[PDB]
Enzyme design. Structure first.
Site, PDB file in Angstrom:
ATOM      1  N   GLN A 155       0.785  -1.100  -0.277  1.00 32.38           N
ATOM      2  CA  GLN A 155      -0.025  -0.129  -0.382  1.00 32.38           C
ATOM      3  C   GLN A 155       0.882   1.536   0.067  1.00 32.38           C
ATOM      4  OE1 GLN A 155      -2.436   0.853   3.237  1.00 32.38           O
ATOM      5  NE2 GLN A 155      -4.425   1.463   1.966  1.00 32.38           N
ATOM      6  N   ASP A 204       2.705   1.794  -3.609  1.00 32.52           N
ATOM      7  CA  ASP A 204       1.543   2.341  -4.464  1.00 32.52           C
ATOM      8  C   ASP A 204       1.081   3.611  -4.100  1.00 32.52           C
ATOM      9  OD1 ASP A 204      -1.446   3.666  -4.469  1.00 32.52           O
ATOM     10  OD2 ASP A 204      -1.456   0.671  -5.863  1.00 32.52           O
ATOM     11  N   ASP A 224       3.341   6.288  -3.393  1.00 32.01           N
ATOM     12  CA  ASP A 224       5.019   7.281  -3.646  1.00 32.01           C
ATOM     13  C   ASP A 224       4.529   6.536  -5.299  1.00 32.01           C
ATOM     14  OD1 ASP A 224       7.345   7.150  -4.416  1.00 32.01           O
ATOM     15  OD2 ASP A 224       7.833   6.370  -2.048  1.00 32.01           O
ATOM     16  N   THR A 276       4.627  11.852  -8.129  1.00 35.84           N
ATOM     17  CA  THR A 276       5.654  11.083  -8.844  1.00 35.84           C
ATOM     18  C   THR A 276       5.722   9.731  -8.951  1.00 35.84           C
ATOM     19  OG1 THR A 276       7.080  10.701  -7.489  1.00 35.84           O
ATOM     20  CG2 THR A 276       6.712  13.200  -7.941  1.00 35.84           C
ATOM     21  N   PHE A 336       7.977   8.334 -10.549  1.00 36.21           N
ATOM     22  CA  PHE A 336       9.237   7.215  -9.277  1.00 36.21           C
ATOM     23  C   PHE A 336       9.148   7.468  -8.204  1.00 36.21           C
ATOM     24  CE2 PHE A 336      10.566  11.172 -12.613  1.00 36.21           C
ATOM     25  CZ  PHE A 336      10.645  10.370 -13.478  1.00 36.21           C
ATOM     26  N   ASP A 365      10.330   7.361  -5.316  1.00 31.04           N
ATOM     27  CA  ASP A 365      11.257   8.202  -4.583  1.00 31.04           C
ATOM     28  C   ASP A 365      10.729   8.398  -3.270  1.00 31.04           C
ATOM     29  OD1 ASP A 365       8.996   9.312  -5.525  1.00 31.04           O
ATOM     30  OD2 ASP A 365       9.968  11.055  -6.922  1.00 31.04           O
ATOM     31  N   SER A 420       8.256  10.068  -2.196  1.00 31.66           N
ATOM     32  CA  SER A 420       7.260  11.328  -2.693  1.00 31.66           C
ATOM     33  C   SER A 420       6.283  11.378  -1.430  1.00 31.66           C
ATOM     34  CB  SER A 420       6.555  11.294  -4.113  1.00 31.66           C
ATOM     35  OG  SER A 420       5.611  10.045  -4.670  1.00 31.66           O
ATOM     36  N   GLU A 450      -5.974   6.769   5.732  1.00 32.91           N
ATOM     37  CA  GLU A 450      -7.052   5.748   5.563  1.00 32.91           C
ATOM     38  C   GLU A 450      -7.057   4.851   6.346  1.00 32.91           C
ATOM     39  OE1 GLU A 450      -6.487   2.918   3.912  1.00 32.91           O
ATOM     40  OE2 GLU A 450      -8.766   2.611   3.661  1.00 32.91           O
ATOM     41  N   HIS A 453      -5.695  -5.438  -2.311  1.00 35.44           N
ATOM     42  CA  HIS A 453      -7.255  -5.541  -1.513  1.00 35.44           C
ATOM     43  C   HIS A 453      -7.227  -6.993  -1.009  1.00 35.44           C
ATOM     44  CE1 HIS A 453      -7.729  -1.658  -3.923  1.00 35.44           C
ATOM     45  NE2 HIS A 453      -7.392  -1.661  -3.211  1.00 35.44           N
TER      46      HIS A 453
HETATM   47  C1  HEM Z   1      -6.906  -1.373   5.067  1.00 33.62           C
HETATM   48  C2  HEM Z   1      -5.791  -1.484   3.294  1.00 33.62           C
HETATM   49  C3  HEM Z   1      -5.940  -0.305   2.406  1.00 33.62           C
HETATM   50  C4  HEM Z   1      -7.867   0.414   2.020  1.00 33.62           C
HETATM   51  C5  HEM Z   1      -8.947   0.969   3.045  1.00 33.62           C
HETATM   52  C6  HEM Z   1      -7.771   0.823   1.013  1.00 33.62           C
HETATM   53  C7  HEM Z   1      -8.138   1.698  -0.351  1.00 33.62           C
HETATM   54  C8  HEM Z   1      -8.967   2.310  -1.401  1.00 33.62           C
HETATM   55  C9  HEM Z   1      -9.237   3.435  -1.772  1.00 33.62           C
HETATM   56  C10 HEM Z   1     -10.436   3.501  -0.775  1.00 33.62           C
HETATM   57  C11 HEM Z   1      -8.720   3.376  -2.565  1.00 33.62           C
HETATM   58  C12 HEM Z   1      -9.463   4.201  -4.293  1.00 33.62           C
HETATM   59  C13 HEM Z   1     -10.640   3.214  -5.033  1.00 33.62           C
HETATM   60  C14 HEM Z   1     -10.741   4.404  -5.822  1.00 33.62           C
HETATM   61  O1  HEM Z   1     -11.867   5.491  -6.026  1.00 33.62           O
HETATM   62  O2  HEM Z   1     -11.007   3.847  -7.345  1.00 33.62           O
HETATM   63  C15 HEM Z   1      -7.658   2.392  -3.169  1.00 33.62           C
HETATM   64  C16 HEM Z   1      -7.313   2.732  -4.335  1.00 33.62           C
HETATM   65  C17 HEM Z   1      -5.347   1.967  -4.424  1.00 33.62           C
HETATM   66  N1  HEM Z   1      -4.884   0.886  -4.232  1.00 33.62           N
HETATM   67 FE1  HEM Z   1      -5.852   1.254  -1.389  1.00 33.62          FE
HETATM   68  N2  HEM Z   1      -6.764   0.435  -0.040  1.00 33.62           N
HETATM   69  C18 HEM Z   1      -5.493  -0.155   1.052  1.00 33.62           C
HETATM   70  C19 HEM Z   1      -4.694  -1.346   0.647  1.00 33.62           C
HETATM   71  C20 HEM Z   1      -4.058  -1.523  -0.734  1.00 33.62           C
HETATM   72  C21 HEM Z   1      -2.795  -2.028  -0.851  1.00 33.62           C
HETATM   73  C22 HEM Z   1      -2.373  -3.141   0.220  1.00 33.62           C
HETATM   74  C23 HEM Z   1      -3.141  -1.684  -1.848  1.00 33.62           C
HETATM   75  C24 HEM Z   1      -1.265  -2.989  -2.664  1.00 33.62           C
HETATM   76  C25 HEM Z   1      -1.035  -3.850  -2.221  1.00 33.62           C
HETATM   77  C26 HEM Z   1      -3.802  -0.959  -2.673  1.00 33.62           C
HETATM   78  C27 HEM Z   1      -3.552  -0.359  -3.426  1.00 33.62           C
HETATM   79  C28 HEM Z   1      -3.840   0.258  -4.147  1.00 33.62           C
HETATM   80  C29 HEM Z   1      -3.468   1.093  -5.385  1.00 33.62           C
HETATM   81  C30 HEM Z   1      -2.353   0.970  -6.518  1.00 33.62           C
HETATM   82  C31 HEM Z   1      -5.000   2.121  -6.027  1.00 33.62           C
HETATM   83  C32 HEM Z   1      -4.810   3.109  -7.439  1.00 33.62           C
HETATM   84  C33 HEM Z   1      -4.195   4.405  -6.555  1.00 33.62           C
HETATM   85  C34 HEM Z   1      -4.106   4.965  -7.538  1.00 33.62           C
HETATM   86  O3  HEM Z   1      -3.787   5.256  -9.036  1.00 33.62           O
HETATM   87  O4  HEM Z   1      -5.799   6.286  -7.729  1.00 33.62           O
HETATM   88  N3  HEM Z   1      -4.216  -0.701  -1.672  1.00 33.62           N
HETATM   89  N4  HEM Z   1      -7.559   1.640  -2.474  1.00 33.62           N
HETATM   90 CA   LIG Z   2       6.742   8.520  -6.157  1.00 33.88          CA
END
Ligand code: HEM
Ligand SMILES: [Ca+2]
Ligand SMILES: *[C@@H]1O[C@H](CO)[C@@H](O[C@@H]2O[C@H](CO)[C@@H](O)[C@H](O)[C@H]2NC(C)=O)[C@H](O)[C@H]1NC(C)=O
Ligand SMILES: *[C@@H]1O[C@H](CO)[C@@H](O)[C@H](O)[C@H]1NC(C)=O
Ligand SMILES: *[C@@H]1O[C@H](CO)[C@@H](O)[C@H](O)[C@H]1NC(C)=O
Ligand SMILES: *[C@@H]1O[C@H](CO)[C@@H](O)[C@H](O)[C@H]1NC(C)=O
Length: 595
Positions: A105, A108, A110, A184, A186, A188, A190, A258, A351
């Site tokens: 998370q 992600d 970053d 960013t 990168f 990094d 951020s 969050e 997730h």
């Molecule tokens: C209890 C832990 C977590 C909660 C409460 C949570 C919640 C959220 C929420 C609300 C979103 C936005 C959904 C949207 O409007 O499309 C999101 C997106 C995202 N999540 Fe999580 N998440 C959790 C754990 C994780 C984990 C463990 C990962 C990766 C290993 C992760 C990776 C991502 C990524 C890459 C995005 C898209 C970010 C972006 O580019 O906008 N999340 N998550």
């Molecule tokens: Ca970054």
């Protein structure tokens, strides 16, 4: 398509590439193309976008409109039918700690953030989207199927606002809509320092020439720092416990509060910053603020890259690690380091790794107090449990000794996220992240599962039997076919995550390919990669090679027993060792001299 480049911001560039330090925004990393990998630009498209109308309308928008001659099933319908499960017994990953989920998370955050529309300044609409569930413009409500128990209890929909897009905000045609990456590309740190100059300076402590990040002024953790509070209204961290009135944290990334383990992870990183800025001063008393802050921040960025690439990625990608990310051979300026739109969905494999509860453990790694174990949903936007209920030590112990959830084709996402998610301003613990991921996939114009199988050079099943063989699960492929009608139509989030995991990894073949390609690009394409000749000296690199998450814990908390390998499943006390036994980071190599 031959055409020139549009962009939301100004590709206003002021590079003058002699400084040894990264910019905050990411600009100037790439010399030939200074905007590449910088924040607030379009996510990259590895394949052209696919919308209902070829331009901006997601599939699922016009109910007459098919995808390949079939209606797309409702995101919440897919959720209930496929993603849901009741029994949390037997769901835990016997060889990944809860920290493995947590790091995912962090990395992600970053790399990508594509915030819902109007990334703007402040106080915007008073929304009818939640009110009446009328789809229009940027309101794209997730509608309930009949039979959905949420219909009895929550009304007809879940709010969902479309993601912002470049050459901006309200209306556009004839170039497909491109979503924004707000951070960013990168790797990094951020998430610690910010991706805009405006937040970067505000997180700093400039009142003293020490090059420190600002710390909380109301509360300390047994004499150790907390993140500053964010004094913005309204606060969801206040909204959750009005009695306690403890705000969210202010961090380099806006999502830090969050859930409590993310806010925890952010608190350790910041601590490491100041611990870093303090040490550099001992060894270089002549060095000024700006200096101490850059050099610390640069060391911190290196620690995140190495932890991610050396420890995390090999136990995500398994046998596919070498296939997509071969050993490093220096900076390549021909590589695109931008995060792709698909990666932003691919990386949501995390997730399926989030378990249903979070624990607090004591010095003997036994339950902390009488409510040591908590249901995850009561911990969204929760910072009072940190400040008023024990600091970060008991939660960090749980990260070490509790386990991630294991992905499971019959138990995909815990109900704590699937039916009890809290989102800011929506007042209840009743949202579904799975339905959100699927509505989002459509929002972002995602090619379907087989287009991605095709991109990755994998077979593209066309029938039920072909899909059963790809998933190695008869009943799951049948549920997908019944909803989708063709595997061409399966959303990438649920199709990638449905594939069984690769050997020694935690994602299947398709995701290992999407994730693998992204990461290899962010490393090879980054001018400031820690291992790129020139960025650090030979001595500094030998010093940076000893970093572990175990040693970070030791330095920034009062925990004295850590496992050597923090991502593996570890049990106290067998796999736990004295802090004294763990490699130190040695800043001697950063000693410099004048006069
Ligand atoms: C209890 C832990 C977590 C909660 C409460 C949570 C919640 C959220 C929420 C609300 C979103 C936005 C959904 C949207 O409007 O499309 C999101 C997106 C995202 N999540 Fe999580 N998440 C959790 C754990 C994780 C984990 C463990 C990962 C990766 C290993 C992760 C990776 C991502 C990524 C890459 C995005 C898209 C970010 C972006 O580019 O906008 N999340 N998550
Ligand atoms: Ca970054
Ligand atoms: C809101 O937070 C407060 C803590 O600030 C919680 O109240 C605490 O609960 C236990 C009950 O024995 C006590 O140890 C504390 O003294 C209480 N503190 C205060 C300041 O009253 C409360 O449980 C939280 N409420 C909810 C609904 O989450
Ligand atoms: C800034 O640093 C000073 C000097 O060490 C410290 O005493 C002060 O609390 C810091 N302020 C903030 C807001 O972090
Ligand atoms: C736990 O995982 C690590 C890395 O994935 C691996 O090296 C080790 O063999 C695993 N332990 C067991 C018992 O499978
Ligand atoms: C740099 O990346 C490009 C495009 O991905 C690739 O074709 C090229 O082989 C790489 N450069 C080197 C020196 O390998």
């Amino acid at each position: 398509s031959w055409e020139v480049g549009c962009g939301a911001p100004v590709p206003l560039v002021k590079c003058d590439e002699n400084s040894p330090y990264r910019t905050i925004t990411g600009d100037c990393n790439n010399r030939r193309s200074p905007a590449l990998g910088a924040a607030n630009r379009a996510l990259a498209r590895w394949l052209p976008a696919e919308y209902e109308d070829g331009l901006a309308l997601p599939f699922g928008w016009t109910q007459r409109k098919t995808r390949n001659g079939f209606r797309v099933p409702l995101a919440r319908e897919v959720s209930n039918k496929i993603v849901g499960y009741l029994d949390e017994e037997g769901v835990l990953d016997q060889n990944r700690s809860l920290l493995f989920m947590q790091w995912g998370q962090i990395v992600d955050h970053d790399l990508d953030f594509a915030p819902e529309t109007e990334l703007g300044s402040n106080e915007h609409s008073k929304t009818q989207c939640e009110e009446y569930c009328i789809q229009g413009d940027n309101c794209f409500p997730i509608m309930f199927p009949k039979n959905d128990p949420k219909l009895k209890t929550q009304g007809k929909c879940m709010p969902f606002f479309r993601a912002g897009f470049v050459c901006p905000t309200p209306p556009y045609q004839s170039l497909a809509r491109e979503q924004i990456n707000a951070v960013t590309s990168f790797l990094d740190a951020s998430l610690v320092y910010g991706s805009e100059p405006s937040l970067a300076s505000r997180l700093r402590n400039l009142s003293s020439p020490l090059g420190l990040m600002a710390v909380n002024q109301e509360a300390w953790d047994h004499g150790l720092a907390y993140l500053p509070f964010n004094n913005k209204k309204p606060s969801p961290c206040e909204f959750i416990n009005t009695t306690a009135r403890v705000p969210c944290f202010l961090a380099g990334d806006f999502r830090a509060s969050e859930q409590i383990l993310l806010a925890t992870a952010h608190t350790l990183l910041l601590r490491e910053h100041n611990r870093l800025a303090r040490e550099l001063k001992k060894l270089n008393p002549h060095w000024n603020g700006e200096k101490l802050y850059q050099e610390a921040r640069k060391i911190l960025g290196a620690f995140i890259q190495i932890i991610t690439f050396r420890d995390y990625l090999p136990i995500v990608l398994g046998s596919e690690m070498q296939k997509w990310i071969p050993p490093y051979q220096g900076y390549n300026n021909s590589v695109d380091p931008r995060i792709s739109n698909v990666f932003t969905f691919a990386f949501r494999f995390g997730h399926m790794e989030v378990p249903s509860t979070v624990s607090r453990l004591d010095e003997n790694y036994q339950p902390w107090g009488p409510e040591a174990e908590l249901p995850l949903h009561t911990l969204f936007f929760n910072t009072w449990r940190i400040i008023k209920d024990g600091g970060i030590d008991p939660l960090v112990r749980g990260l070490l000794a509790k386990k991630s959830k294991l992905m499971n084709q019959d138990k995909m996402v815990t109900s704590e996220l699937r039916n009890k998610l809290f989102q800011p301003t929506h007042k209840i613990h009743g949202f579904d992240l799975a339905a959100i991921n699927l509505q989002r996939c459509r929002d972002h114009g995602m090619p379907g599962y087989n287009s991605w199988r095709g991109f990755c050079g994998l077979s593209q099943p066309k029938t039920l039997k072909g899909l059963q063989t790809v998933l190695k699960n008869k009943i799951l492929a049948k549920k997908l076919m019944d909803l989708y009608k063709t595997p061409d139509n399966i959303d990438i989030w649920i199709g990638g995550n449905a594939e069984p995991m690769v050997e020694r990894g935690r994602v299947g073949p398709l995701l290992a390919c999407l994730l693998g390609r992204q990461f290899q690009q962010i490393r090879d394409g980054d001018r400031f990669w820690w291992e790129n000749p020139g960025v650090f000296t030979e001595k500094q690199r030998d010093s940076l090679q000893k970093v572990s998450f175990s040693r970070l814990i030791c330095d920034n908390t009062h925990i004295t027993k850590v496992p050597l390998h923090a991502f593996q499943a570890n049990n106290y006390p067998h796999d736990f060792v004295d802090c004294s036994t763990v490699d130190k980071l040695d800043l001697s190599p950063w000693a410099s001299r004048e006069n």
